[PDB]
């Protein structure tokens, strides 16, 4: 489903970053980085999930997963 992360969506992200011209190789590259990021955040969040003996990944699980990676996120609790 990684291919569902489409070329023109990636282009908008880059434009929000002030990117003006983009190599065609950036898109499969970008897909690979998003995938690594998600694999590390979700793994830590699930690890918080299973610790609480739950089957449902809450927002706080993710928020904690991100704080662990040094990525504090605001607007879902803390």
């Amino acid at each position: 489903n990684i291919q569902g992360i489409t070329k023109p969506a990636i282009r908008r992200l880059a434009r929000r970053g002030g990117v003006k011209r983009i190599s065609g190789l950036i898109y499969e590259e970008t897909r690979g980085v998003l995938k690594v990021f998600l694999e590390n955040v979700i793994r830590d969040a699930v690890t918080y999930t299973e610790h609480a003996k739950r089957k449902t990944v809450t927002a706080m699980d993710v928020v904690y997963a991100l704080k662990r990676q040094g990525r504090t996120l605001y607007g879902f609790g803390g």
């Binding site: 690890t47 918080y48 610790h51 609480a52 706080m60 904690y64």
Partner: peptide, 23 residues
């Protein structure tokens, strides 16, 4: 410490040590 605190648990048990090692 933080694990126990999120689960409203007041005891650090070995199950917290293991999960912390896994993180």
């Amino acid at each position: 410490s933080r694990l126990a605190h999120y689960n409203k648990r007041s005891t650090i048990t070995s199950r917290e040590i293991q999960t912390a090692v896994r993180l």
